[PDB]
Design an enzyme around this catalytic site. Structure first.
Site, short mmCIF file in Angstrom:
data_model
loop_
_atom_site.label_atom_id
_atom_site.label_comp_id
_atom_site.label_asym_id
_atom_site.label_seq_id
_atom_site.Cartn_x
_atom_site.Cartn_y
_atom_site.Cartn_z
N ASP A 1 -22.27 23.33 -37.77
CA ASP A 1 -20.94 22.75 -38.09
C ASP A 1 -19.80 23.64 -37.55
OD1 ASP A 1 -21.52 20.30 -39.27
OD2 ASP A 1 -21.22 21.00 -41.35
N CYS B 1 -20.51 13.15 -28.52
CA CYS B 1 -20.43 13.92 -29.78
C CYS B 1 -19.41 13.18 -30.65
CB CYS B 1 -20.11 15.37 -29.44
SG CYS B 1 -18.80 15.53 -28.19
N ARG C 1 -19.18 19.43 -27.03
CA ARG C 1 -20.66 19.49 -26.87
C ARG C 1 -21.10 18.59 -25.70
NH1 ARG C 1 -22.09 18.53 -33.36
NH2 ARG C 1 -20.50 20.01 -34.13
N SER C 2 -20.52 17.40 -25.56
CA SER C 2 -20.81 16.46 -24.44
C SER C 2 -20.51 17.17 -23.10
CB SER C 2 -20.00 15.20 -24.58
OG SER C 2 -20.37 14.40 -25.71
N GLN D 1 -14.16 22.57 -25.29
CA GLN D 1 -13.01 22.54 -26.24
C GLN D 1 -12.62 23.97 -26.68
OE1 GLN D 1 -14.55 19.38 -29.07
NE2 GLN D 1 -12.40 18.82 -29.22
C1 LIG Z 1 -27.98 24.55 -37.44
C2 LIG Z 1 -29.12 23.59 -37.84
C3 LIG Z 1 -28.67 22.13 -38.15
C4 LIG Z 1 -27.74 22.08 -39.32
O1 LIG Z 1 -28.11 21.71 -40.42
N1 LIG Z 1 -26.42 22.47 -39.11
C5 LIG Z 1 -25.42 22.57 -40.04
N2 LIG Z 1 -25.16 21.69 -41.15
N3 LIG Z 1 -24.17 22.18 -41.79
N4 LIG Z 1 -23.75 23.33 -41.16
C6 LIG Z 1 -22.61 24.19 -41.63
C7 LIG Z 1 -22.12 25.23 -40.62
N5 LIG Z 1 -24.52 23.61 -40.07
#
Ligand SMILES: CCCC(=O)Nc1nnn(CC)n1
EC number: 3.1.3.48
Length: 284
Positions: free
Chosen positions: A181, A215, A221-222, A262
């Site tokens: 995220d 994305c 990301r794209s 970005q």
């Molecule tokens: C990195 C593996 C996939 C995943 O669950 N990512 C994810 N979901 N919430 N976050 C908060 C930063 N990061």
């Protein structure tokens, strides 16, 4: 200049922010008049992210031909990509119309439907075999055929049916489900692995229409996905692969869609992916 050396030179000097702003400064500016028409306001997820008029994808209907999607055509690499935003509730039908009209084989999705507790794109594919989706505005039917869920990404086989002609096609959905995220992955290993899986499928190959990549906005990301692919392809094709200038490839790509890459962290991650991908492939 070998990019691996340029990389350490930028890293040791901590000038990533200063490189990134140079790109932003030199990047092309073209008109986006169709995107800003008032009739198209609810076809745009972000007010500051628009396709250029010269490179935008047109829908094949007389009503309103507009979708937030751009054709990136890389002449020397001999690759085309469509970069688009995550579909909206009212553009899911347009999205699948575009996949049909452009004869795409693959959809690449680099974001989860929910991130940071907000909706990043519509649930635009069926989650169960026996619950198919119908898009009445574009007269298409979509069915989940199979699903292969792995640790870093999921591949789905879909069947898209043109209810007007009853033709059907197999579309592959490549879903990178593990982009964190905040920031970028720490290692590019799993991103490169996912790129080789898309290539393996034939989705990037000239016997099909261009791959559709998205994305949330279709630029971050794209951007990383199509910059890395094109840079590695050019390192295969050319007599001196140290000649490949990732900043020059990015500026060429930014002639076709605004904002590609970005952040300065995404630029750094792009270098790492290409540097690491160049190896491995290089004799294995
Ligand atoms: C990195 C593996 C996939 C995943 O669950 N990512 C994810 N979901 N919430 N976050 C908060 C930063 N990061």
């Amino acid at each position: 200049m070998e990019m691996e050396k340029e990389f350490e030179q930028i890293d040791k000097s901590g000038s990533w922010a200063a490189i990134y702003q140079d790109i932003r400064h030199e990047a092309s500016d073209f008109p986006s008049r169709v995107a800003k028409l008032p009739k198209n306001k609810n076809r745009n997820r972000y007010r500051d992210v628009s396709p250029f008029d010269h490179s935008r994808i047109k829908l094949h209907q007389e009503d309103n031909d507009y979708i937030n999607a751009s054709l990136i055509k890389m002449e020397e690499a001999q690759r085309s990509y469509i970069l688009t935003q995550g579909p909206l509730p009212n553009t899911v039908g347009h999205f699948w119309e575009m996949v049909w009209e452009q004869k795409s084989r693959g959809v690449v999705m680099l974001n989860r439907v929910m991130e940071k507790g907000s909706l990043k794109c519509a649930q635009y594919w069926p989650q169960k075999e026996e619950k198919e989706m119908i898009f009445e505005d574009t007269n298409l039917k979509l069915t989940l055929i199979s699903e292969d869920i792995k640790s870093y990404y999921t591949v789905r086989q879909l069947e898209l049916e043109n209810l007007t002609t009853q033709e059907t096609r197999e579309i592959l959905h490549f879903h990178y489900t593990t982009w964190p995220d905040f920031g970028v992955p720490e290692s590019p290993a799993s991103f490169l692995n996912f790129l080789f899986k898309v290539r393996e499928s034939g989705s990037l190959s000239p016997e099909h229409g261009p791959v559709v990549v998205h994305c949330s906005a279709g630029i971050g990301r794209s951007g990383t996905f199509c910059l890395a692919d094109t840079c590695l392809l050019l390192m295969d094709k050319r007599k001196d692969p140290s000649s490949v200038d990732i900043k020059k490839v990015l500026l060429e790509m930014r002639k076709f869609r605004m904002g590609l890459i970005q952040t300065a962290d995404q630029l750094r991650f792009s270098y790492l992916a290409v540097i690491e991908g160049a190896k491995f492939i290089m004799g294995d």
